[PDB]
Enzyme design. Sequence first.
Site, PDB file in Angstrom:
ATOM      1  N   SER A  77       0.815  -1.224   0.000  1.00  0.00           N
ATOM      2  CA  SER A  77       0.000   0.000   0.000  1.00  0.00           C
ATOM      3  C   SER A  77       0.845   1.269   0.000  1.00  0.00           C
ATOM      4  CB  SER A  77      -0.898   0.031   1.237  1.00  0.00           C
ATOM      5  OG  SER A  77      -1.941  -0.919   1.154  1.00  0.00           O
ATOM      6  N   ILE A  78       0.394   2.290  -0.725  1.00  0.00           N
ATOM      7  CA  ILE A  78       1.035   3.600  -0.649  1.00  0.00           C
ATOM      8  C   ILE A  78       1.090   4.088   0.808  1.00  0.00           C
ATOM      9  CG2 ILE A  78       0.688   6.059  -1.226  1.00  0.00           C
ATOM     10  CD1 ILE A  78       0.015   5.188  -4.069  1.00  0.00           C
ATOM     11  N   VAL A 131     -15.666   4.772   4.946  1.00  0.00           N
ATOM     12  CA  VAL A 131     -15.992   6.169   4.647  1.00  0.00           C
ATOM     13  C   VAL A 131     -17.321   6.351   3.919  1.00  0.00           C
ATOM     14  CG1 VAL A 131     -13.608   6.988   4.760  1.00  0.00           C
ATOM     15  CG2 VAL A 131     -14.576   6.279   2.563  1.00  0.00           C
ATOM     16  N   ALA A 156      -5.487  -2.220  -5.013  1.00  0.00           N
ATOM     17  CA  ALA A 156      -6.391  -1.349  -5.754  1.00  0.00           C
ATOM     18  C   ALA A 156      -5.994  -1.230  -7.223  1.00  0.00           C
ATOM     19  CB  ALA A 156      -6.461   0.036  -5.106  1.00  0.00           C
ATOM     20  N   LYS A 168     -11.018  11.516  -9.424  1.00  0.00           N
ATOM     21  CA  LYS A 168      -9.756  12.157  -9.057  1.00  0.00           C
ATOM     22  C   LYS A 168      -9.727  13.648  -9.410  1.00  0.00           C
ATOM     23  CE  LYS A 168      -7.464   8.611  -7.217  1.00  0.00           C
ATOM     24  NZ  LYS A 168      -7.246   8.513  -5.721  1.00  0.00           N
ATOM     25  N   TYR A 171      -8.906   3.885 -16.972  1.00  0.00           N
ATOM     26  CA  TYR A 171      -9.060   4.570 -15.693  1.00  0.00           C
ATOM     27  C   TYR A 171     -10.463   5.157 -15.574  1.00  0.00           C
ATOM     28  CZ  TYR A 171      -7.333   6.782 -11.416  1.00  0.00           C
ATOM     29  OH  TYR A 171      -7.118   7.169 -10.111  1.00  0.00           O
TER      30      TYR A 171
END
Lengths: 257, 257, 257, 257
Positions: D18-19, D64, D195, D162, D155
Amino acid sequence: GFLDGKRILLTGLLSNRSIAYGIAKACKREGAELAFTYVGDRFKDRITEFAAEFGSELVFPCDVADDAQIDALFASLKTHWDSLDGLVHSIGFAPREAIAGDFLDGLTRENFRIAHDISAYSFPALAKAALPMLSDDASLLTLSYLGAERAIPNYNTMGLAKAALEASVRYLAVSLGAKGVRVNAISAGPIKTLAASGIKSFGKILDFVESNSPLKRNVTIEQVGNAGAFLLSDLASGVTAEVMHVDSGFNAVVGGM
Amino acid sequence: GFLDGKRILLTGLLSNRSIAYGIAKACKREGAELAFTYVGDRFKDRITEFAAEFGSELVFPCDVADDAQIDALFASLKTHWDSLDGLVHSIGFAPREAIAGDFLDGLTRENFRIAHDISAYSFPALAKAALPMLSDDASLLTLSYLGAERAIPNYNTMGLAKAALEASVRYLAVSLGAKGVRVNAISAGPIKTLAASGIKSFGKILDFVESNSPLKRNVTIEQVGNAGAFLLSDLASGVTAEVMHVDSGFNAVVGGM
Amino acid sequence: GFLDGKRILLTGLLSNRSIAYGIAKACKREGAELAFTYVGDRFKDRITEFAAEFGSELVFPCDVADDAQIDALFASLKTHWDSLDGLVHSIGFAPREAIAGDFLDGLTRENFRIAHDISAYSFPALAKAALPMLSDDASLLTLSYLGAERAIPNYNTMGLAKAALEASVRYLAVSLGAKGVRVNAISAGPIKTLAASGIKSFGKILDFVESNSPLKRNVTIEQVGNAGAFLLSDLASGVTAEVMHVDSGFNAVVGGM
Amino acid sequence: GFLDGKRILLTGLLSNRSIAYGIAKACKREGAELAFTYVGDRFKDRITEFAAEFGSELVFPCDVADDAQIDALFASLKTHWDSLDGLVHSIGFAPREAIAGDFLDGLTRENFRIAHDISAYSFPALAKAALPMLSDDASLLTLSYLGAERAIPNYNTMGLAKAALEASVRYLAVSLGAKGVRVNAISAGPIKTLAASGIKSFGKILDFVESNSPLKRNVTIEQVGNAGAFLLSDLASGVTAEVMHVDSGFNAVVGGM
Ligand SMILES: NC(=O)c1ccc[n+]([C@@H]2O[C@H](COP(=O)([O-])OP(=O)(O)OC[C@H]3O[C@@H](n4cnc5c(N)ncnc54)[C@H](O)[C@@H]3O)[C@@H](O)[C@H]2O)c1
Ligand SMILES: NC(=O)c1ccc[n+]([C@@H]2O[C@H](COP(=O)([O-])OP(=O)(O)OC[C@H]3O[C@@H](n4cnc5c(N)ncnc54)[C@H](O)[C@@H]3O)[C@@H](O)[C@H]2O)c1
Ligand SMILES: NC(=O)c1ccc[n+]([C@@H]2O[C@H](COP(=O)([O-])OP(=O)(O)OC[C@H]3O[C@@H](n4cnc5c(N)ncnc54)[C@H](O)[C@@H]3O)[C@@H](O)[C@H]2O)c1
Ligand SMILES: NC(=O)c1ccc[n+]([C@@H]2O[C@H](COP(=O)([O-])OP(=O)(O)OC[C@H]3O[C@@H](n4cnc5c(N)ncnc54)[C@H](O)[C@@H]3O)[C@@H](O)[C@H]2O)c1
Ligand SMILES: CCc1ccc(Oc2ccccc2)c(O)c1
Ligand SMILES: CCc1ccc(Oc2ccccc2)c(O)c1
Ligand SMILES: CCc1ccc(Oc2ccccc2)c(O)c1
Ligand SMILES: CCc1ccc(Oc2ccccc2)c(O)c1
């Protein structure tokens, strides 16, 4: 520090208000070894004092209008350093009339030529002269301004030159990138420096950014310096061809309404 | 037509493949009266034929490297036209080595100077010389390329010059805007012209845009010409300081993956 | 005219101040055949009068919140037109609190959802529903605002939705481009419309753009309409995935200093 | 370290690829105290191990999508920390069909809604819920992608989300800036994460960036992590409303030709 062992050459450190002074202070704090350039014999003593403040006696003259001085700069530096890890281009100039009043009133072929020669060409020119001694993970940094992106009153001919400078960051990043060298700019907010005082109504820009930036404050050379030190370091090894704003977010808003 | 009565001066019409030829054809179709410039005595007969094709005998020499020729251009034009409604700057030049191979290999101070002088400075220089005769609703148009925005292989020094050119559109728009004059650029997709053939591997760019643009096709001088005629007209009276892409949408994608 | 024979469906024509009214007027002038949508039974008579003014009785209800109404729109239109050449999306909505005061004060999940649903999703949703009847050279146009690009006081949640809308222009351009269909937006300057009056302190934005735009004047629905008609036409066949500013150049400056 | 004493909450740490893991590692190295969120009961043990690796037992559930869980997150965190100095939003989601193949094929109202709800709305939603406990010099960081700026194959709907996310950075920066809080994004290059594997043909993007980026290499979570730690720190006190590319310069070129 995060610049331990890094050898960095800084241009443009004219006074203790200079953006380059802030960058120098941050780089020294983070462990870098520094060297400095100056222009004009009357500045030798001043730049030598600054270098000493940052633990260095490495000072060299370089008027970037002069090909011979650019070549002699790196020949001189090479007698001391086998390799160069960082280069800070903090150099801009335009004739007074080209940064005051109406854009066309101050436009001449020579004013255009000089502004682009000193403010834009000199960055990749230094990069090319430095290349034989650049380390594979070297980092080159220049300073730009929002005037490149949008029309700002009085900035005029310097806006054109900064746009060319930002394009040079991208073309330099491609040229030097396969070797591993990174190239970036910081687009700094207004800071009262000697160069800044040449722009007509700079005080108005300073006040407007203070009132309308997201952080409601102007940036300092310490803030620009820290961003600069970051970009010059291996912390930023993923970052190249970037124009990073350090301007309290001012570039990102439509202010004053 | 939507350019009825408009008097438009076009630079850069070198051959029937020139972007300026496409702009000329569209402008004439929409009712404009045209005048043309050329560079070099051997081209006088050719440009005169083109002018005649567009119903005009108004042809003038102008090497934009030369201040005197720029001034004499508008003095000559003024003997014919009291006012000028449109100006098309379709002029670019860089020495061959500055648009081939590695960016730094082809970088010299003189190559930089020349590319910026002819490709960028000349646009606001023409605007300034034209200003005394510009009508209040005049429209000035230049041609740019995506190389200004992002690094394109081989485009190199021209990328810097186009970035400065696009900045000049914005500063010109501010200078001339209160009078009512508009200033814009078209960022054209690749088209096989004489100038284009100077760029190393232009054929690769042409093929890539054909395959990867949203419309899966290259643009033509007719398409650029129509966009140009629009910007020069009162249809576009709400538009200034704009860089309009006419490139089949190529600028807007990440292609080839 | 340059839209001879083109069949164009316009959404969003609410009053004679609407951006869509200006687009309708320009399209009719240039030879297009028009059809219109409306939302809410009380508006049937008004939109019918507008359609008649533009030589058409083609009027259809469509609340873009409702999938069924979107599908029924194109089924209804198809009973009249075998093919559709143009689509104008001139639709935006956000709850009042989401476009007033502080950005976080007016942020709720539902306000976010609604603003993005009506203002952004609805554009590619209409494009998808229209696709079976779109001509190969059809052109789809939406309206955006500078608030997508930079933070504008009070625009708040609509800024997020317009950013998504502009991204949808690019992804739509790729999806539809191989067929030959073009997709673009106009980023219009401030115009006093019913929707505009929902933004807190819109009057301040209007006055600021009048004083600080390069042309020192606000745009009109006639100017936006002409730019729109251009983009919908074969004159613009080289242009897709573009967000064209029609805002007197305001986007391109840093004003008010 | 340059984050001594700073208390930072990290979302999105799913695996050691993960980032957020890279950001956590860099933040801990520089002296920060960390806390973490997770989604889904089966992940409690894994996130607890990660937290322990970074010297913390502060772990909280937060989906979330759920207003109640967002509120309970900060109520829980507050029982431990009087103030919060950093917030890392490293959260994105879209239904599989919305990030594969043609943009319109995978577009539905619900797919749009979900992608924007989780990937964009959740960032300012967390900021708003955190605000009562944010320190005056707090720093909020999100992760974006180049797909916001230009159309990238597959994408698709995430590109729209984004773009809205990047706009939220700017509007958040204005809302929170007067207090002194900074808000930024990193636009990261492709990294193989869980992801990322949801995007059709992600492998092609990864390979293309490796071959065509200026540095001719893909970025790592260590590089993104270091850039992140910088932005979260007082080193970056001059930087807000910024979208910083950490992608080996890929965003700045036209590659593959
Ligand atoms: N101060 C600001 O608000 C601000 C904002 C954005 C960008 N910048 C840029 O930062 C850089 C540094 O300027 P500063 O603001 O620190 O002011 P400064 O006056 O302290 O520094 C400018 C430097 O340019 C050098 N220079 C000028 N001509 C030269 C030549 N021919 N050869 C070598 N050096 C030459 C000067 O000697 C001086 O050291 C400039 O590029 C400037 O454009 C400044
Ligand atoms: N062809 C393309 O793919 C393309 C794409 C984007 C932008 N452009 C730009 O369009 C413009 C026109 O070029 P073109 O493609 O139509 O090729 P072209 O060769 O037909 O036109 C170039 C023109 O520049 C003129 N020129 C060069 N030096 C000059 C000087 N010193 N004084 C006056 N004129 C001079 C030439 O005479 C010529 O007429 C250029 O600015 C070019 O950069 C071209
Ligand atoms: N007026 C400006 O200054 C300005 C500037 C830039 C962009 N825009 C944009 O232009 C577009 C048009 O707005 P306008 O300024 O002409 O104002 P307007 O009020 O005349 O038009 C807005 C339209 O949105 C329609 N609409 C709202 N909710 C809808 C729904 N659920 N289904 C279908 N239609 C719905 C309204 O009916 C109305 O026709 C909007 O997208 C707006 O964001 C306006
Ligand atoms: N990997 C890349 O190449 C790349 C590039 C640019 C941006 N990003 C972005 O970086 C961020 C992190 O993703 P990653 O690449 O590290 O992959 P990842 O799978 O490791 O992380 C994604 C995280 O999103 C979280 N998430 C999904 N739905 C959620 C919900 N409803 N509530 C709370 N959390 C939820 C997941 O639990 C996961 O922890 C994302 O926003 C992604 O879009 C990734
Ligand atoms: C308004 C911010 C700003 C201040 C100073 C600058 O340095 C200059 C200015 C003019 C000529 C040369 C260098 C600059 O580039 C931008
Ligand atoms: C790749 C598209 C392109 C083709 C031709 C151009 O005109 C030139 C090129 C080089 C030097 C001078 C003018 C140009 O600017 C861009
Ligand atoms: C300031 C210019 C402007 C005016 C009106 C607009 O239309 C709206 C506004 C708010 C909600 C919905 C539509 C818009 O988008 C931008
Ligand atoms: C190509 C780089 C990239 C990889 C992973 C990402 O995270 C995602 C992707 C899809 C849905 C949700 C999160 C992302 O945003 C961008």
